[PDB]
């Protein structure tokens, strides 16, 4: 009662009883500023007119799925060294350089597929977009198996941003780039689940 406890179990029982007398939750009223977390922006909307239609995006996504099926037929049938930024740029884009034939991309493993994708984005940042480049990006994306690592998600978002940026420079819908850009954005934004970048019109 007003003795002390001689065994651990008694002490605990004694604690427990005290801990049921206490309030279970306790809030204290205080009376009276914040760091920032830098967050990567989304995709630069499309100029008026330029945004493609839902039925077109849905159309390509479906088509792109199919394309990836075929990419596994050829893939059973089996280059710069994987780390060679420069050579890979040359190899693909050249001066010309090589197209992405199934011959050659189905031979590229996933970690390479990914690295190359980086190298062609790094080219794209400081060079203009060709249709040669468009082909490779489209290819490498079709050669990306999923679920994707996050590093590789961030990659293709970078690339989808970079497209939306370049799309603002265009001055007539008759630009060769527009469709290619709208596509890549659509694919990243709908095929690879980054719908926070998608062109909802």
């Amino acid at each position: 009662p007003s003795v002390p406890p001689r065994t651990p179990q008694e002490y605990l029982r004694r604690v427990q009883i005290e801990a049921a007398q206490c309030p279970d939750v306790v809030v204290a009223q205080i009376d009276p500023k914040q760091s920032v977390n830098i967050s990567l922006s989304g995709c630069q909307p499309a100029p008026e007119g330029y945004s493609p239609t839902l039925q077109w995006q849905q159309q390509q996504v479906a088509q792109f799925s199919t394309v990836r099926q075929n990419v596994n037929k050829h893939r059973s049938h089996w280059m710069p060294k994987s780390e060679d930024e420069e050579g890979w740029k040359k190899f693909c884009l050249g001066e010309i350089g090589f197209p992405p034939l199934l011959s050659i991309v189905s031979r590229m493993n996933q970690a390479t597929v990914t690295s190359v994708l980086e190298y062609l984005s790094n080219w794209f940042g400081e060079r203009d977009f060709t249709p040669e480049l468009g082909r490779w990006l489209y290819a490498l994306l079709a050669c990306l198996e999923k679920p994707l690592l996050p590093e590789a998600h961030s990659l293709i978002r970078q690339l989808a941003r970079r497209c939306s940026e370049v799309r603002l420079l265009v001055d007539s819908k008759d630009d060769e780039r527009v469709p290619a850009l709208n596509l890549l954005i659509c694919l990243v934004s709908r095929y690879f689940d980054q719908r926070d970048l998608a062109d909802e019109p």
């Binding site: 394309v67 075929n70 990419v71 199934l102 489209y138 290819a139 709208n182």
Partner: peptide
């Protein structure tokens, strides 16, 4: 078809209307 990607691309660019 070895260039089947290249084709599918262009088909896909082309198809914007």
């Amino acid at each position: 078809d070895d260039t089947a990607l290249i084709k599918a691309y262009d088909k896909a660019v082309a198809s914007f209307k």
